[PDB]
């Protein structure tokens, strides 16, 4: 509002507590954004890690799991999403509380919990279960029996890998 | 028109004890809520008109 203008602040103080209300609103917005970022991703306490052997029954999760080769430690699909201090006058940009590395670690932990545990890690202790047996129980939740998976696991893994491969191509095109 | 601060409202009697030098007084919202009697130094309680 005012420049240096040593007399402009005395006049601004006569209009009431407008600056206090605006600063309180901005602080509330910042705290609300931080709480949203915390409640969206940080939903679990244990940080799960992917096993060294990436053989999860035959399903290739290499495109969604984080890549340890690159220094950012992110997923190749997330790299496509990310690749898709200014103090001029007054208005500044505050950095978020959780950096991109922490969000990537949260997503990797959630993915590891979904692969190893599936659904038991989100309702208590992480219970290990094979992925071909996890999908066999997930099929029972929609009506299809579990023998269909034990008979067409190869076709299902092929279709899943094809869909995962086409997702990145559709996002790039 | 107590002590020059002319206002309107219901004048009542409160249980407040003013200091021997403070005459009038405000509240959290900085509004006159109690004043001393000019010729009696009695602790009156001015309330907003109904």
């Amino acid at each position: 509002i005012c420049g240096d203008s040593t007399e402009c602040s005395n006049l601004l103080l006569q209009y009431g507590s407008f600056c206090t209300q605006l600063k309180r609103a901005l602080t509330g917005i910042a705290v609300e954004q931080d709480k949203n970022t915390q409640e969206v991703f940080a939903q679990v306490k244990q940080i799960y890690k992917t096993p060294p052997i990436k053989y999860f029954g035959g399903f290739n999760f290499s495109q969604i799991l984080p890549d340890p080769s690159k220094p950012s430690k992110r997923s190749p699909i997330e790299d496509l999403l990310f690749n898709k201090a200014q103090k001029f006058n007054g208005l500044t940009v505050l950095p978020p509380l959780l950096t991109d590395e922490m969000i990537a670690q949260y997503t990797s932990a959630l993915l590891a919990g979904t692969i190893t545990s599936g659904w038991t890690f989100g309702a208590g202790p992480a219970l290990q279960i094979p992925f071909p047996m996890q999908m066999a129980y997930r099929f029972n939740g929609i009506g299809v029996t579990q023998n269909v998976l034990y008979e067409n696991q190869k076709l299902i893994a092929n279709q899943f890998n094809s869909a995962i491969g086409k997702i990145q191509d559709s996002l790039s095109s | 028109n107590f002590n020059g601060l002319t206002g309107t409202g219901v004048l009542t009697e409160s249980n407040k004890k003013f200091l021997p030098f403070q005459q009038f007084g405000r509240d959290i919202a900085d509004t006159t809520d109690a004043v001393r009697d000019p010729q009696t130094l009695e602790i009156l309680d001015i309330t907003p008109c109904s």
Partner: protein, 199 residues
């Protein structure tokens, strides 16, 4: 923990601060000699008083409009929270919801609503398993000339024998024909073990 009622006290503090600011902004002048209208009407002449009162009335109208806009935004937020709480009550108290994390962290069992000042408290009863043990599992078992799949359970093994247990509680039971079903033979399922069923 007195800080458990965070939002219930936060809304009251916000309302009190808004009211206190709306009342305090009346003593601030917006380009006049003072803030009291009586002083403007008495000291200065009417041709100047009616001009100087314009700034005061404009400032007061702007402050009241700002207060009303903030109250509308807060009322929209409160309506969203009240709809969320009503859905929570209707789905957790009046029934048994299967939505994860909705009726508390864990398997929802019950929920007891309680009254609160400008709010509602839900006591979600959650089922949390504990004391887990590692067992040897298998997708299915292979009989003499057919395969058997668990109907409601999981084929576990304590190391020597094989039993069928529940998915959320360990109950070792013998593998009978009343809890399995035949589908195909032992030529398409990967990881099937050779075990005998009980008829």
């Amino acid at each position: 923990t007195p800080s458990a009622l965070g939002k219930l006290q936060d809304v009251v503090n916000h309302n009190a601060q808004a009211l206190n600011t709306l009342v305090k902004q009346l003593s601030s002048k917006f380009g006049a000699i003072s803030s009291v209208l009586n002083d403007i009407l008495s000291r200065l002449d009417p041709p100047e008083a009616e001009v100087q009162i314009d700034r005061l009335i404009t400032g007061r109208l702007q402050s009241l409009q700002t207060y009303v806009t903030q109250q509308l935004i807060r009322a929209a937020e409160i309506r969203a929270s009240a709809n969320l709480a009503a859905t929570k009550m209707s789905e957790c108290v009046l029934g048994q919801s299967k939505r994860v994390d909705f009726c508390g962290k864990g398997y929802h069992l019950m929920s007891f609503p309680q009254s609160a000042p400008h709010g509602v408290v839900f006591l979600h009863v959650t089922y949390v398993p504990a004391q887990e043990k590692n067992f040897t599992t298998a997708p299915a078992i292979c009989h003499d000339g057919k395969a058997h799949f668990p109907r409601e359970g999981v084929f576990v093994s304590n190391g020597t024998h094989w039993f069928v247990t529940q998915r959320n509680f360990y109950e070792p039971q013998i593998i009978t024909t009343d809890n399995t079903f035949v589908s195909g033979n032992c030529d398409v399922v990967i990881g099937i073990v050779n075990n005998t069923v009980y008829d």
